[PDB]
């Protein structure tokens, strides 16, 4: 049977584009498409696709559950067995739900986190989807309670593969392949096992306006970047690490609150070191 | 002694042709004994030699879990590699890993190994000291920095000194009558005319184990190591191997040519000649 795939993503916004490819007998040409309820009834009046099928711009009519069959002339039937199924889900059709992490978006290696999707719209289902992955969104039935529908997605044990930017979506009864606008995104970052850095203040953590204070993140480990986070919930600051004469790697953030710093590496934004010890400014 | 255990992983992306795939195979010396393939409907580590089949369910369950985790890790590593090399997500790429341990006659560790490659070239390798890395390029140097910060070499060293040796010892015992019993080659020489002036002499070795063997042609005692056609050693399909060595000789001079065979299954080295 053929291998059917959606590119670049099976979860796709209205107005966007997605291409279905049907790989069979080491080629991508000559195939027909079918959707889940009409299984032996080829779509587009039996259109025989000569190459990958580009849907662009994407409309809600494209949402659905597809299989393909490849041409097979010198065989009993004209065609192959049905491919694996690919579900095209079209987003942007309802108000967006909300997504939050419990207890938070920074998740220790090996531990678990809950990503809760919720809405005051009654969604029959919720979908959780990590950015860039071809992994099919996770689906859960919504649970109704006190004027909201919601679902709890359990994520972990935490590893790099589970780390990244997540969005959640709802769908309503009778249009299960039509998704809401995405929730605001949540960056879920794995921390550890890389060794924790050191945090310090120069000249010190005691400051009175208006004098300058710089916080320095330092490690013997060759981190490429440092992240300064303040428990007060401003989005972390990031700076390149600079190698020092005594071979440490350090970044200086010129600026109260309680701070921590984390190291990270080039091309690797969702995995950070264990957190430094806390520092009160 | 001496013996080795090695695991070989191949992790491959193939956008539009299939899901990324992870295959692992395990060897003791030249004998494969386990395999895991992520494409299987219900992937499990599975036996590929009879002497491992009576290992208990806890072994299979544990190895299966380990392979599933390694498969996830290497699928993600393929993504990471794309970023490191600024490559498009349309192309197909391969990560390969081989690791394991060599032990002496006494069952004690002689050497540990852990090497990885990306698209068929060296990527990063554990050094002989089992405490430091050699990175082949700048991307691999990123991987090196992570592994140093995470103390990976210490964990791997612990594996190579402990479990790897202990289990290799167990398997060598489980399979003693096959793994520790060399099979000498059955040998013969064939003669094939080329012209009415020249002919080929071919020295054959068949049905031997282990794969290590030496076939040489001499002409009055001088190796023709420069004028010998030597075929790659090949599997017979029954856990034995085959090889041949050929030399082109002038007609009527066949008798000054000797084939010398060296293998552990042989009491004494063989010296054969065509008649």
């Amino acid at each position: 049977k053929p291998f059917l795939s959606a590119w670049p993503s099976a979860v796709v916004p209205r107005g966007g584009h997605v291409t279905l490819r049907c790989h069979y007998r080491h080629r991508f040409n000559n195939f027909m498409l079918y959707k889940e309820d009409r299984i032996h009834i080829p779509i587009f009046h039996g259109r025989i696709f000569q190459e990958s099928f580009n849907m662009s711009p994407v409309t809600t009519a494209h949402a659905g559950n597809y299989t393909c069959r490849g041409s097979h002339p010198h065989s009993p039937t004209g065609w192959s067995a049905p491919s694996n199924p690919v579900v095209i889900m079209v987003t942007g059709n309802h108000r967006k739900p909300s997504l939050l992490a419990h207890p938070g978006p920074l998740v220790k290696s090996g531990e678990r986190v809950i990503l809760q999707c919720w809405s005051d719209i009654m969604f029959e289902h919720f979908f959780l989807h990590k950015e860039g992955i071809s992994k099919d969104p996770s689906r859960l039935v919504g649970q109704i309670h006190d004027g909201v529908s919601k679902a709890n997605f359990s994520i972990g044990p935490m590893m790099l593969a589970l780390a990244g930017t997540y969005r959640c979506y709802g769908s309503v009864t009778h249009t299960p392949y039509q998704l809401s606008a995405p929730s605001d995104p949540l960056d879920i970052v794995v921390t550890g096992p890389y060794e924790k850095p050191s945090l310090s203040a120069q000249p010190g953590p005691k400051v009175q306006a208006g004098e300058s204070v710089t916080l320095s993140c330092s490690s013997r480990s060759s981190y490429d970047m440092y992240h300064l986070s303040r428990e007060g919930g401003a989005h972390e600051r990031r700076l390149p690490a600079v190698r020092k004469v005594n071979r440490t790697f350090q970044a200086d953030f010129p600026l109260g609150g309680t701070y921590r710093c984390f190291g990270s590496f080039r091309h690797s934004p969702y995995e950070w070191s264990d957190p430094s010890d806390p520092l009160l400014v | 002694g001496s013996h080795s255990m090695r695991y070989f992983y191949t992790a491959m992306s193939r956008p539009g042709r299939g899901e990324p795939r992870f295959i692992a195979v395990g060897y003791v010396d030249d004998t494969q004994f386990v395999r895991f393939d992520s494409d299987a409907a219900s992937p499990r580590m599975a036996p590929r030699a009879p002497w491992i089949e009576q290992e208990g369910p806890e072994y299979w369950d544990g190895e299966t879990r380990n392979m599933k985790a390694s498969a996830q890790t290497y699928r993600e590593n393929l993504r990471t590699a794309l970023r490191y090399y600024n490559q498009s997500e349309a192309g197909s790429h391969i990560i390969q890993v081989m690791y394991g341990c060599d032990v002496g006659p006494d069952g004690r560790l002689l050497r540990g190994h852990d090497q990885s490659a990306y698209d068929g070239k060296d990527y990063i390798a554990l050094n002989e000291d089992l405490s430091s890395w050699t990175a082949a390029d700048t991307a691999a140097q990123i991987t090196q920095r992570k592994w140093e910060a995470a103390r990976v070499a210490e964990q791997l060293r612990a594996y190579l000194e402990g479990l790897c040796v202990e289990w290799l010892r167990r398997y060598l015992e489980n399979g003693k009558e096959t793994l520790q019993r060399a099979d000498p080659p059955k040998t013969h020489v064939t003669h094939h005319p080329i012209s009415d002036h020249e002919a080929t002499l071919r020295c054959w070795a068949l049905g031997f184990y282990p794969a290590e063997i030496t076939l040489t042609w001499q002409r009055d005692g001088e190796d023709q190591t420069q004028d010998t056609e030597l075929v790659e050693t090949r599997p017979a399909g029954d856990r034995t191997f085959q090889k041949w060595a050929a030399v082109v000789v002038p007609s009527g001079e066949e008798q000054r040519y000797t084939c010398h065979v060296q293998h552990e299954g042989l009491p004494k080295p063989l010296t054969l000649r065509w008649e």
């Binding site: 590893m159 790099l160 995995e271 | 695991y7 692992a24 395990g26 386990v34 580590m45 072994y59 190895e63 380990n66 392979m67 985790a69 390694s70 890790t73 290497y74 993600e76 590593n77 990471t80 590699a81 490191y84 990560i95 890993v97 690791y99 990885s116 990123i142 991987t143 992570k146 592994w147 990976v152 964990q155 791997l156 594996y159 479990l163 790897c164 289990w167």
Partner: peptide, 9 residues
């Protein structure tokens, strides 16, 4: 027995 050590690039 296979290595239990994670090798994340």
């Amino acid at each position: 027995l296979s290595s239990p050590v994670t090798k994340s690039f």
